[PDB]
Write a protein that binds this DNA or RNA. Sequence first.
RNA 1: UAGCUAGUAGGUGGGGUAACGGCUCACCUAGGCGACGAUCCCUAGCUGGUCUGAGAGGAUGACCAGCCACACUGGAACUGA
RNA 2: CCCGCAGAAGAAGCACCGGCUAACUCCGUGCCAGCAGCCGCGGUAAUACGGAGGGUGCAAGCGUUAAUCGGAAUUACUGGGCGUAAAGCGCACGCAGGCGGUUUGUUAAGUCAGAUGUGAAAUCCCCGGGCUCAACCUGGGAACUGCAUCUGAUACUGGCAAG
Lengths: 122, 205, 129, 82, 80, 156
Amino acid sequence: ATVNQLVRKPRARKVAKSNVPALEACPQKRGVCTRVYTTTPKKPNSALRKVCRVRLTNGFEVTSYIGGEGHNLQEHSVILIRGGRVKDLPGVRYHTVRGALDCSGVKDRKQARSKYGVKRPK
Amino acid sequence: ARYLGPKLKLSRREGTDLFLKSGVRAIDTKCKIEQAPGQHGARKPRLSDYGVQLREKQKVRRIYGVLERQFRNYYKEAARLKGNTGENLLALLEGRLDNVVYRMGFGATRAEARQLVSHKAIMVNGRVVNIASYQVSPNDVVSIREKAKKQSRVKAALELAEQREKPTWLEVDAGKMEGTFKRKPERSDLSADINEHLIVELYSK
Amino acid sequence: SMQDPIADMLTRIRNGQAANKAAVTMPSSKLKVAIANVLKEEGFIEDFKVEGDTKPELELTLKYFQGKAVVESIQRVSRPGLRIYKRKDELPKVMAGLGIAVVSTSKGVMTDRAARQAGLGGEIICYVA
Amino acid sequence: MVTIRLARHGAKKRPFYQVVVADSRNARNGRFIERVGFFNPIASEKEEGTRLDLDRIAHWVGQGATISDRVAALIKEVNKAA
Amino acid sequence: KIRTLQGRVVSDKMEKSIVVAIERFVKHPIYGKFIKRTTKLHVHDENNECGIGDVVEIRECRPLSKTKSWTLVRVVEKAV
Amino acid sequence: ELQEKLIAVNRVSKTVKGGRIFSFTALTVVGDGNGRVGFGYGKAREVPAAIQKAMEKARRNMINVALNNGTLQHPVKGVHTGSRVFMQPASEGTGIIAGGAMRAVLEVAGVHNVLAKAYGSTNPINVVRATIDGLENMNSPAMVAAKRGKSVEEIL
RNA sequence: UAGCUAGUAGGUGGGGUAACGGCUCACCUAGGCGACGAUCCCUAGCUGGUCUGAGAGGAUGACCAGCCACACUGGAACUGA
RNA sequence: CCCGCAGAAGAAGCACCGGCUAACUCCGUGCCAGCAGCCGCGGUAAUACGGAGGGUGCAAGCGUUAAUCGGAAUUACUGGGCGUAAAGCGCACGCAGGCGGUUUGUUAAGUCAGAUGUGAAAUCCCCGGGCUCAACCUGGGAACUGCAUCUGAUACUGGCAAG
Ligand SMILES: [Mg+2]
Ligand SMILES: [Mg+2]
Ligand SMILES: [Mg+2]
Ligand SMILES: [Mg+2]
Ligand SMILES: [Mg+2]
Ligand SMILES: [Mg+2]
Ligand SMILES: [Mg+2]
Ligand SMILES: [Mg+2]
Ligand SMILES: [Mg+2]
Ligand SMILES: [Mg+2]
Ligand SMILES: [Mg+2]
Ligand SMILES: [Mg+2]
Ligand SMILES: [Mg+2]
Ligand SMILES: [Mg+2]
Ligand SMILES: [Mg+2]
Ligand SMILES: [Mg+2]
Ligand SMILES: [Mg+2]
Ligand SMILES: [Mg+2]
Ligand SMILES: [Mg+2]
Ligand SMILES: [Mg+2]
Ligand SMILES: [Mg+2]
Ligand SMILES: [Mg+2]
Ligand SMILES: [Mg+2]
Ligand SMILES: [Mg+2]
Ligand SMILES: [Mg+2]
Ligand SMILES: [Mg+2]
Ligand SMILES: [Mg+2]
Ligand SMILES: [Mg+2]
Ligand SMILES: [Mg+2]
Ligand SMILES: [Mg+2]
Ligand SMILES: [Mg+2]
Ligand SMILES: [Mg+2]
C-alpha cells in the first residue's frame, strides 16, 4: 500500500485459471468415448444423467455430458466436445455436441433444433 | 433485410398508429388498435425501465422500417455528431430517402415509397438514386421520373399526402412531381410523441 | 519524528476549525508563512502573526462565517513520501475552481489561478476548499 | 538508386497512386524517403486528381534521383496545365 | 559546449580506467515516486589521475575496449 | 411540481411464535425539479400502504440543493455507511449517466446533466442517502464568495 | 535460481578489420559483473499499431508498413560494391 | 453503367418467452424423461422439461463454444484495506534503503518556462472530396501525451558551506 512498498514489490494481477482446460483455448475438440455411463445428480436433484468419459486428441481424459433425450453412443465413438458444466454432475465440465461426427441429432425435436443438431422438418 | 409481416400487428403492439396503412380507412376499423397482439393482448403488465426504453426504440424502428444493425449505426453516427444525440438520430432517420419520398407524398406508406425507390422511380438531383438509406442533403431536388410519373399509385399517394399534414422542411410541386429538401428538420419540427431520450439511454447502457 | 511541517500546519488548521478554536499556533517557518500569506489573500483565514526571535511562533486567526468553518477541506498533496509537480497545463482546479490550490512556483508560493496566469507550474502543496 | 515513382493505393479497380521518393530496391508500397505528391487516375471532373510538389521533385532530381516514366508524364501534364 | 556527464568514481583499480556511477533521479512510471537510479560506466582515464570517491566529468568517445567507451574530461571535488 | 418515484420495494420478515410475519418497505424519492429533493422510507404490511407512508415522509424533510443551470456545481463525493458515491457535472446534452437509485434521486432533484458512479455497496437506501448528502453539501459560487469575504467575480 | 567470470576486466606491444574494439595473440596488472537482481531456469520475434476502458490501465502483435532472425539439420567459407 | 422483355413471379430463417431479461397459455410426462449462464426447475393441476398455439428479439443470418478487456474500487498510481469479516512480525536492536526541525549563502541535480530537432507512412479523430448510398478509397489538418539539446527561473526537494 505504501508507495515505497509498491515500488519494492508491485501489485500482482490475479491469474485466473480456465474452467475448461482440456479445450486448451479451442472452441471444440475431438475425442473417442472411452466409456459411456449414467450418474446420479447432486442433492437437490434426482436423475440418471448420461455422460461419457472421453480421451481427447490432445491426451486429456475428461468427462462429458450427453444432452438431449436418447443417444446412439458407445465405446469407440468419435465425438466433438464443447464447453459447459452440468452444475449438477460434480466434476463434469464439457458437453458433447449433438449433431457432430459419431453423435446423432436428437430424434423428433422441433424446437432448439440448432442446439441439438436436428435438421429442419418439412 | 425488411420486415414482411403484419403491420397493424406492429402498430397494436406499440400502441400508437405507426402509419403502416395509407390512412384511407381508420385504424380502429382495420384492427383492435387498443388491444395488443395475440392470445394475451387483453392484459397490460407493468413495464420495467428496460422494457419501456425497448418499446420506444421498437416504435421508432417500426415507424421508419430500419433493422437493428442499421439503427445502431445511425445512433453511433448521431452520438459522434455534435449536439444532442437523440435529436441527431431523429434528424438522420428523417433524412433517409424513403422517408423524404413519403413526406413529399410519392407513396401512401413508407413501404410504398421504399418500393418506388428500390424500383428506380426517384431521381435525386436528376440522378436516379436507388438506395433507401441514401441520406438526402439540404437543397436537394427529388423527383418522380416520367415512367413512374404515369403511375396511378403515385397520383393517389399525392392525394393522400394532401390530406395529411404537410412538412415544413420540404417544398413539393404536385404537377411537376418534384420536391426540394430545403433543410434537415429540427426536433421541434418533428413529432412530440417520440421520446428520443429513452433510445439514447438504451443504446448508452 | 516530525517529518512534514506543512502537513502538520494543515492538520492543525483542520483540527482548529473542527474544534471551533479561535487561533492555532505552530512553529514558524518561511514556507509556512508564505502558505499562510496565500491563505489570507484568498480569505480562508482571518490573519497570521509571527512572534518571537529565537524560535518564532506563527499564530493564525481562523475564520468562521455562519457558525461553521470557512475552510471546508484542506488536504496536503505533495508530501515527503511522494512529491507532486505539475506543468502549467496540468495544474488542478480544486472544487471546479471554487477552492484554491497552493502551488510553489519559481516565482514564489502562489495559488493555482495565479500560477496559471503567470504561466508556470510547480510543486502542488495542497488543495483548499 | 533513389527514384521517384508511383505507389499503388486505394481499392480494387480504383487505383490511387502516391508519388514517393524511394530507394529503387525497396518494394513498390514499402519503405520510401519522401512522399512528394499523388495521382488519381479515376478522378472525375471538378476534382484535382493530380498534385505534384514540383520544387521537391526538382530538388531530388538535382540530388541525382531518377524518375519513373509515368511520373515524368505526370510532370509534363502538370506543366502544360499550369 | 560538448555533451558530458558527471559522476562519482565507484572504483579505480583497473589501470588507466575508472568506474563512474551516474545516479539519475528519475520518476517512477506508475507510482510517481522519484527513485534514485544508477548508471555504472567504465571510463578511460590516462595517467590514472582519478581517485575513488572523486567526482568526475566524462564525455562519450569511440570505444577503447570491450566495455570502455567514455573518457574523462575534468575532475572536480577530488578530496579525500 | 413534486415529481415522485419509488426506487425499491423490498419484503422483510419478522419471526414470532406462530411463524413468520412479512411486511413491505418502500423507498421513494420526491423533488420539485428546481433543487429540492427528499427521500422517504415507509413500512407497512402491504405495498400500497408502505408506498403512501414513504411518500408522506419524503414530501416532508426535503432539502435544498444549489444547482447551476440544471447541472452540478462541482464534482462531489458522498458517503453513507457502505455507499460511497461520486458525481460530476457534465456538458449540456450528456443526460443523467447514473445508476438506479442514483438516477432516480438525481432526476427528481432536477439535475439534467450528470456523470455519476456508485462505489462501495449499492444498497438502494444507503446509496440514496449518500447521494442526497453529497448534493446537500455541494455549495455554489455565491456561497463560496460569502464565506471567503470576496465578490463572486474575484473567485469565478 | 546468490553468487558469476581466466580472454575473464584493464594496460603495453604485434597481427587483423572497410572500420573502433580481447576481434586475435604475447606479456603485465588483478581485475570485472552482482540485491538498481549478476548467473541460472521458463516463456517470447520487436515496433507503428489492434481490441477494450471515461481515463489510468489491461490484453495483444493476424492483415498493412518499419526493424530483426531463419531457409531440411549442423559447420564453413568463396565470389562480390 | 444504361436500355428493353415477361411475370409476384426465383428468394426467411434462428434463438428465446420463471427472475436477472423483451415475450404465456394448453396438452404430454410425474424427482422420470429431461433443462440450466447464475438462482434454480421436474415427486400427477410444470408460464422453467417435450409438443403445439400465441408472443418477443435479431434477420441472410441466428445461436452455442472458445478467447480478451469491461463491469471488477475483485492488486485499489488515479482508486481498497488489516480490533471482531482475509490481514500488525511474539518483542526488540540494527546495516542497506525510505523519510528529515530551523536560518543564510551558493549550486542548479529533481522541478518549472521557452525555443530547436525528432516523434516514418498507414491507423485514431476533425473539415472536405470520390465510388448511386454505405462499407471502402482519399485531400488537408489535429494528434503522436515521448525523447534529446540549448537558453532561462530558483519557491520547493537534492547537493555543498556556515549557523
Ligand atoms: Mg492459480
Ligand atoms: Mg430438484
Ligand atoms: Mg446486412
Ligand atoms: Mg591493439
Ligand atoms: Mg596495430
Ligand atoms: Mg518461439
Ligand atoms: Mg520467433
Ligand atoms: Mg474502470
Ligand atoms: Mg502469419
Ligand atoms: Mg542472415
Ligand atoms: Mg541459407
Ligand atoms: Mg520442410
Ligand atoms: Mg548450412
Ligand atoms: Mg557484383
Ligand atoms: Mg570478396
Ligand atoms: Mg419480463
Ligand atoms: Mg430451453
Ligand atoms: Mg398426467
Ligand atoms: Mg399438465
Ligand atoms: Mg426458464
Ligand atoms: Mg418449455
Ligand atoms: Mg480493475
Ligand atoms: Mg476490501
Ligand atoms: Mg481475523
Ligand atoms: Mg503486537
Ligand atoms: Mg528540511
Ligand atoms: Mg538523505
Ligand atoms: Mg535543470
Ligand atoms: Mg503517423
Ligand atoms: Mg460523399
Ligand atoms: Mg535550493
Ligand atoms: Mg537547499
